[PDB]
């Protein structure tokens, strides 16, 4: 079932699937606010940020086709990756998150995530949590804390951490319904196709082993990047968390 | 003005003008034309089973941005390998680079968008310094190494053992290089693309051409189709440097 | 204790604290020819009956002094790690000699070769079901876990688990003792070279979460590496798991 | 030859051949305050006036009894490299120390080290114009030149060129020595430590095509790094160049 290059008739070499996917990963969150006024120019036409709620995370997911269940035994690469985001609250007629800034360590979720509005580049991301058989630290509870961090081009993104200070639930993040998306393929000539469409994006949502706790954030800045877009900002939260969900094919909205 | 995710008044690719300098390893091989066919989209004839392996080292700029290696040296600067087949679009002879890795995603979100075809991989080229006193540079009994590998499997190695000074005899050009600009739907409502589009570089310059003993090595990887390539004989080596200017590719039909 | 050596010590690779790590883990046993795995080991180790172990790992490490450096320095903090290890013995005291191994974070390179361990840097993956994941869930029955390690372009060797049962200490072939060669050598006739065995001991240990499969090990090759050594196997079982240990350095044995 | 040792010797990071390098370096110059660059240098280098240099290179080295082993194994005949150097003096022997050092292959990791080069593992980019780019031509005036360094996801520092003129030996500023410190710590009292003082010198040496111009430099900072030493400094000049040099084992001066 695969549907993009490399295209060839068994699909083998093709980066993602025409199928639905399931996804578990873990969390590290910030909630911030800035200035609405500045995030809704980074928004596509037709979404209304929100009080200027944004959402900085970082987090180790793990994705799986239903065309190819098995696959980890013989690709495990293709199987795991990291992701970094600053994600602006915002609505449409119903309320979801734009994920403007996205930076991913494997180009098969660049892609996927582009087919579905998702805007993404590539960087190097870590989370790091304390392991639970680490005997220094033990996992999670009071006193652990997260950290994470992202780069591009020899560039610091962001870092984000936190300090836990107790067991949390879904109190302890704000939970929005929707994902909008920008399904965006301009055309580099006049005479090229392109694709420019407001989409909306998962089922089967799990959340849990989630911990709240004191967090903290630090912008950094690139010559490719936007990153002061979100410089004024006032820290409202941390949480760390487990979450898993399934999605297929996001729906075109205009 | 940059004309890509993320759009803001931070783009991956500008709507410009681009220019290129690079070092190349290429080897030429010859397959079977039917399993090459299997590789082209519609519209696009296998020649003889001409195919071309490289690897090569490239320095690209934007006219929007001539000194951006200034501040951002690599956003100007990436490796890549490919496997391509010579064919023909009516009776007007190309590639079709079926099959790209590259190591900087600005580089493949701009492939795509002129119908390149690329993955992310990890992608180097070496060639002998100049300066080292060792070796020297090219010249006769110079050797010339390509690697390429993505999710821990190797896909490809070349090299060269430079045997002469060479020229554009050395070569094997075709004027058109052809791609398929595609962008699917995951989603019956998402609207497709599906179209081939033709590059024209403008300005090209090729150089310092040698000629030599060539090697390849195909691996094999299970999110792969390298085995299309693998029945091969191998026909000749060049390591070469050249310089072109490329805008967008234009569209030739839809598929 | 390492460079970069300035008067705070914050630059430094590697100091003298102690550490604690936790870790996920693939591991594939097998049996090799005890004669060509003998010329592997340095002098004093005696192979056992041939048995090797492959393993990769997901590792998190941290250090008693910095326990909450992870908050700032996340890089710091997690590397993962490939190997191929020697069942072998000094007298009659049981261990492994981890002859290849491979790692993604140097500060784990230099504290390995400190203490004897031979590590490289490479790619490394090892890809595990996450929990939540509603297609598969986590590590049950039929559950498949792999691992790959790579460098310079060259694919080291693959390793994958298709989980058949729980399982528990008994599938895992612990020998104590992880040998070492601390070996420092001259590039110049006037430098000071190192060379000696070492043999470190867990000082805490900890297994658990443990599931048994069907095992397979595919050996790459590369014109930089060995791994012929380890090619004409008996492939023996195939296990993954959770490890928790502490280890400070290791205790000299002889001159070499 | 070191680990991994095996009878062949051909998975060994490093041998103790002489080799050869070529490169492209792109150096910036600057002053700090000598007071806080003499508590980088080890025992035994006296700092000169504060002279430092900051450079970024892409490196080709060669071993001279393994000619054309990039042939087959590419990756281990290139690397790239960023340092901070301190001008300093052994007696009145005029050298630099290279205090920090981050390099993008372990190979060269190590066999610094063995010379007594501070190294760590970074991510590491030179960019100048490819002479056959339409766009920008080559090296000229008008011409920039760009690198970068990072670690742990934290930018290292970054340097620039914006080339003015052709230029010469005299916009170098060559010292004849570097000076290494050889130090290969105990991690556990029984084992056998190393500190020494040592000497590299050139057997061979050119640069050439040489370019001055404007130059800029940005030090980043890391929490594992100590950056902050070089931070308070005046630019002197900026260079971009090409090198080629044989050097083999450092010759040990004196133990520390």
Known sequence: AGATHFLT???QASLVDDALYGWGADML???LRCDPARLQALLPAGLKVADGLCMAYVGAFQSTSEDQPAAMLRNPAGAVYNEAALSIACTHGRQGYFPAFVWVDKE??????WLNGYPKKIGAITLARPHPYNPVTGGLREGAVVGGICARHGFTL???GLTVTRA??????????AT???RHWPALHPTQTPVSELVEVRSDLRVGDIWAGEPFIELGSAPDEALECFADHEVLAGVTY??????????RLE
Do not use: C, E, K, N
Not at 108 to 113: E, F, H, P, T, V
């Open 9 to 11: 008739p068994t699909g």
């Open 29 to 31: 969150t910030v909630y």
């Open 108 to 113: 098969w979720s660049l892609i996927r995530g």
């Open 158 to 160: 962001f870092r984000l």
């Open 168 to 177: 949390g639930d879904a109190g302890d993040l704000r939970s929005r319904p």
């Open 180 to 182: 909008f998306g920008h």
């Open 242 to 251: 487990s979450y898993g969900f399934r999605i297929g094919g996001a729906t």
